[PDB]
Amino acid sequence: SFVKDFKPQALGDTNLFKPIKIGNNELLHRAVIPPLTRMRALHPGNIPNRDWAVEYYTQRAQRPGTMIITEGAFISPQAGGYDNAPGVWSEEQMVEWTKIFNAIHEKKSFVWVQLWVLGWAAFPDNLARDGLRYDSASDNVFMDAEQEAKAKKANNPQHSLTKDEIKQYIKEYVQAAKNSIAAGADGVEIHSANGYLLNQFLDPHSNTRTDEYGGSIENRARFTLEVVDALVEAIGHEKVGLRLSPYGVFNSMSGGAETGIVAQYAYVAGELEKRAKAGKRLAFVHLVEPRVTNPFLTEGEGEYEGGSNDFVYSIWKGPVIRAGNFALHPEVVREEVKDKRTLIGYGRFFISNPDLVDRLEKGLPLNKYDRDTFYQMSAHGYIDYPTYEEALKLGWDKK
Amino acid sequence: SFVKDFKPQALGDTNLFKPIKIGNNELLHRAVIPPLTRMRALHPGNIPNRDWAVEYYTQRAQRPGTMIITEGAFISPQAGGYDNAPGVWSEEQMVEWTKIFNAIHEKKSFVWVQLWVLGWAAFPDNLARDGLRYDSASDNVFMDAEQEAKAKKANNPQHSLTKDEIKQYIKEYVQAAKNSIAAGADGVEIHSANGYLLNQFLDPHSNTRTDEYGGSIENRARFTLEVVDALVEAIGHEKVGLRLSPYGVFNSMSGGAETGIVAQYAYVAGELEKRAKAGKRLAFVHLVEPRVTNPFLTEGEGEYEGGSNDFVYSIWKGPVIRAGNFALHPEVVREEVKDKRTLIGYGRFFISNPDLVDRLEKGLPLNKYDRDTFYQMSAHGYIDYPTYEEALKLGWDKK
Ligand SMILES: Cc1cc2nc3c(=O)[nH]c(=O)nc-3n(C[C@H](O)[C@H](O)[C@H](O)COP(=O)(O)O)c2cc1C
Numbered sequence: 001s002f003v004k005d006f007k008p009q010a011l012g013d014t015n016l017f018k019p020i021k022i023g024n025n026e027l028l029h030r031a032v033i034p035p036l037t038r039m040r041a042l043h044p045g046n047i048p049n050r051d052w053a054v055e056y057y058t059q060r061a062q063r064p065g066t067m068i069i070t071e072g073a074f075i076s077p078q079a080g081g082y083d084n085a086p087g088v089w090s091e092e093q094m095v096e097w098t099k100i101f102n103a104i105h106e107k108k109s110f111v112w113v114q115l116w117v118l119g120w121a122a123f124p125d126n127l128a129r130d131g132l133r134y135d136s137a138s139d140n141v142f143m144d145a146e147q148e149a150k151a152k153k154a155n156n157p158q159h160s161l162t163k164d165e166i167k168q169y170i171k172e173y174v175q176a177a178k179n180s181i182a183a184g185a186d187g188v189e190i191h192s193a194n195g196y197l198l199n200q201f202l203d204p205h206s207n208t209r210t211d212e213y214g215g216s217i218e219n220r221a222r223f224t225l226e227v228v229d230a231l232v233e234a235i236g237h238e239k240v241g242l243r244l245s246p247y248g249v250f251n252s253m254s255g256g257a258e259t260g261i262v263a264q265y266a267y268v269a270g271e272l273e274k275r276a277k278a279g280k281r282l283a284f285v286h287l288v289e290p291r292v293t294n295p296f297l298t299e300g301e302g303e304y305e306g307g308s309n310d311f312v313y314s315i316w317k318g319p320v321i322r323a324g325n326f327a328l329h330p331e332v333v334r335e336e337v338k339d340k341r342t343l344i345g346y347g348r349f350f351i352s353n354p355d356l357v358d359r360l361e362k363g364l365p366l367n368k369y370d371r372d373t374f375y376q377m378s379a380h381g382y383i384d385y386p387t388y389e390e391a392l393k394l395g396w397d398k399k
Numbered sequence: 400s401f402v403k404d405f406k407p408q409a410l411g412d413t414n415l416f417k418p419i420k421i422g423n424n425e426l427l428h429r430a431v432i433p434p435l436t437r438m439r440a441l442h443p444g445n446i447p448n449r450d451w452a453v454e455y456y457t458q459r460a461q462r463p464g465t466m467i468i469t470e471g472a473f474i475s476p477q478a479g480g481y482d483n484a485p486g487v488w489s490e491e492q493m494v495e496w497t498k499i500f501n502a503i504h505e506k507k508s509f510v511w512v513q514l515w516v517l518g519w520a521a522f523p524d525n526l527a528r529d530g531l532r533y534d535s536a537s538d539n540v541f542m543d544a545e546q547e548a549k550a551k552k553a554n555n556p557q558h559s560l561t562k563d564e565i566k567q568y569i570k571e572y573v574q575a576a577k578n579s580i581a582a583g584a585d586g587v588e589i590h591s592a593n594g595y596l597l598n599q600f601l602d603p604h605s606n607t608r609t610d611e612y613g614g615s616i617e618n619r620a621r622f623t624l625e626v627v628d629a630l631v632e633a634i635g636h637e638k639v640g641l642r643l644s645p646y647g648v649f650n651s652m653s654g655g656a657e658t659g660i661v662a663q664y665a666y667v668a669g670e671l672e673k674r675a676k677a678g679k680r681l682a683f684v685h686l687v688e689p690r691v692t693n694p695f696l697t698e699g700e701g702e703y704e705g706g707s708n709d710f711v712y713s714i715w716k717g718p719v720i721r722a723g724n725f726a727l728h729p730e731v732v733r734e735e736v737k738d739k740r741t742l743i744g745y746g747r748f749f750i751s752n753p754d755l756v757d758r759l760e761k762g763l764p765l766n767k768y769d770r771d772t773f774y775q776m777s778a779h780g781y782i783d784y785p786t787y788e789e790a791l792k793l794g795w796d797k798k
């Protein structure tokens with residue numbers, strides 16, 4: 001069915017339908033598909049789903065000029081820990097990713113691979129099964145109760161990385177980015193948000209290190225900016241994006257309760273503009289809004305009102321993508337895109353609406369999403385959400 | 400004469416005329432007199448002007464419940480270097496400051512003393528005459544051409560403070576704050592703005608130190624927060640304010656060109672909220688707007704548009720006073736005071752308009768200021784600007 005009590009508003013008269021160049025890509029509109037894990041990859045091997053993944057992505061790349069950011073992909077076995085999320089380290093994975101990039105490109109859209117490293121959010125027991133460490137910034141702070149029950153059942157205790165093991169993760173980031181560009185992706189997004197490994201180093205609560213990687217704003221930002229620099233040297237700055245969630249509390253990050261959190265993120269944004277001046281301006285900065293502090297809470301829940309992401313615009317002067325409960329709020333989008341370098345990411349409603357861009361342009365009703373198939377090993381709730389036409393044929397009132 | 404082509408707007412219906420408590424003071428409206436050096440103090444001795452200062456301050460304290468922040472006062476001889484600005488270290492100065500505090504208080508207004516230390520903005524030759532050092536954060540960066548011509552004529556070379564000499568300045572800050580409260584002031588404002596000594600330590604361009612006081616966001620902020628902490632232990636947090644100018648370029652500060660400048664100030668604001676939580680919330684934070692990057696440029700000149708002070712509101716949650724070209728822009732003030740904890744500082748127009756608060760409330764024309772007597776050893780252009788009544792009697796068209 002369609003979302004019951006939503007009053008749609010056509011947005012075809014706003015800057016959301018004005019072209020913008022992002023890296024090497026000339027987008028025809030500014031609604032982007034933000035990275036969405038869907039757990040349909042195959043075990044063993046973390047292989048992109050052979051039956052359904054090309055279709056899913058082809059469906060959402062139907063409006064020409066759409067920028068699509070893939071589900072997070074593990075850079076290596078040690079960066080992983082969920083059996084059904086895909087990786088981007090082996091030939092076998094890349095043979096399936098090439099087919100996905102080709103299909104999106106045949107539809108004249110673009111595809112950016114999000115590079116993912118789990119840290120303490122990984123399952124310690126999957127990793128122990130495979131002989132891998134359970135990594136984080138520190139070893140005296142854990143993510144939550146059931147993550148520590150898991151780690152000790154598994155007898156795979158949380159480990160503070162050494163500088164050498166951080167260096168190895170940077171090695172893997174570069175290779176995975178090389179693999180994605182060689183297989184045909186237009187660019188990569190460094191996931192440094194939502195409480196996963198790079199964010200565990202950025203955050204004061206998860207990072208109690210005393211070396212060069214913890215203990216001050218500069219040191220907590222070190223591993224994220226070494227990744228930016230390594231990938232910029234490897235594949236070019238116009239092929240690299242960075243995602244940040246200043247106010248997120250998902251996976252036990254501090255959010256607005258940490259009084260130093262705006263300074264921690266203002267520093268990263270300032271270092272990025274610094275490089276921009278020296279010629280190496282990243283393709284974009286992607287921000288998760290305080291409108292959504294936890295993506296598994298219903299739209300309207302976990303909204304943080306004591307802070308804003310607008311400080312980033314005083315520092316970084318390049319394109320910024322903003323995501324977080326924008327689909328049910330065209331009146332907020334309307335104001336936000338008056339800014340000429342702002343793009344809007346629509347997550348949960350791009351899951352249920354393959355043709356979201358036409359529905360936004362035209363002010364058409366929105367298909368409800370089914371939360372129960374967000375993570376399911378099924379085609380159902382993945383490739384069978386109807387376009388508006390199909391939904392009318394199905395009678396989702398109007399027949 | 401009145402300002403020729405200004406269209407006044409009455410502001411009596413806005414939050415600028417709603418009471419607010421600031422420290423121990425219950426202000427009856429939110430227009431404050433920001434600190435304004437006027438150079439009428441007497442040499443030798445940096446004595447507050449015996450003939451005119453009580454009158455000046457009495458005139459501007461005429462609307463009950465007005466918060467007045469004094470001209471900057473030197474905490475000690477070594478903090479000074481301008482012969483005609485006042486100090487707050489000797490008995491002789493305090494006997495004249497007591498008379499000023501009494502007069503303001505008889506008018507049922509309040510008075511906060513701004514504590515001032517010059518650093519590299521001092522005249523090296525006045526200081527050498529008196530046997531004093533020419534101080535700054537560093538010794539390999541100078542303020543400008545004529546400050547270095549002065550220093551070498553005077554053979555009084557710029558000196559990087561040692562930790563012991565920083566400690567001594569903190570000793571003097573506490574004593575000067577004790578002296579002001581003992582003589583009857585309601586509170587003190589720490590001047591950490593406009594390119595003077597504490598701001599020379601906060602700024603990356605003026606601070607190239609490698610010790611505990613330079614070299615990172617935390618270290619550059621160290622001397623300002625040790626001052627905050629020392630004064631809070633000495634006289635109470637509800638009697639201490641802090642003034643900051645994130646985007647100012649006056650006296651050779653970096654402003655918005657430094658990509659790290661928002662992070663440097665977001666850190667200070669976050670440390671202040673940190674203490675606020677631990678019970679010691681400062682009376683207010685006072686910010687100079689990017690609307691005025693240099694106060695000696697005519698209203699409308701030197702406006703920095705690539706940055707905003709609004710990030711401070713995401714971090715500090717207490718009262719904030721904002722100053723910078725607000726008198727000729729009631730439409731900007733109207734929007735800005737919709738926020739319930741914002742106060743507006745009016746500088747240059749409180750010089751020329753003793754009764755500015757009534758003229759703001761009622762939408763009455765504004766007296767032009769005479770830039771030539773801002774710094775003059777005269778009563779003219781200091782105590783003889785007319786109230787609206789007097790200006791009508793004088794025929795400043797309308798007779
Ligand atoms: C099912 C699901 C999976 C997600 N997976 C990822 C992911 O792989 N990478 C990421 O950075 N964010 C992920 N997110 C967050 C979204 O990109 C987006 O920031 C969030 O859903 C808020 O936007 P929304 O309100 O438009 O859905 C996920 C969210 C959902 C609901």
Ligand SMILES: Cc1cc2nc3c(=O)[nH]c(=O)nc-3n(C[C@H](O)[C@H](O)[C@H](O)COP(=O)(O)O)c2cc1C
Nearest residue numbers: 433434435436470471694722723724745746747773
């Ligand atoms: C004559 C004059 C003297 C000033 N003296 C000081 C001072 O002692 N302390 C201070 O922090 N700012 C000083 N300022 C700055 C003002 O407090 C204010 O921030 C600035 O004038 C911008 O406000 P305006 O546009 O309302 O005048 C001075 C400005 C002027 C024009």
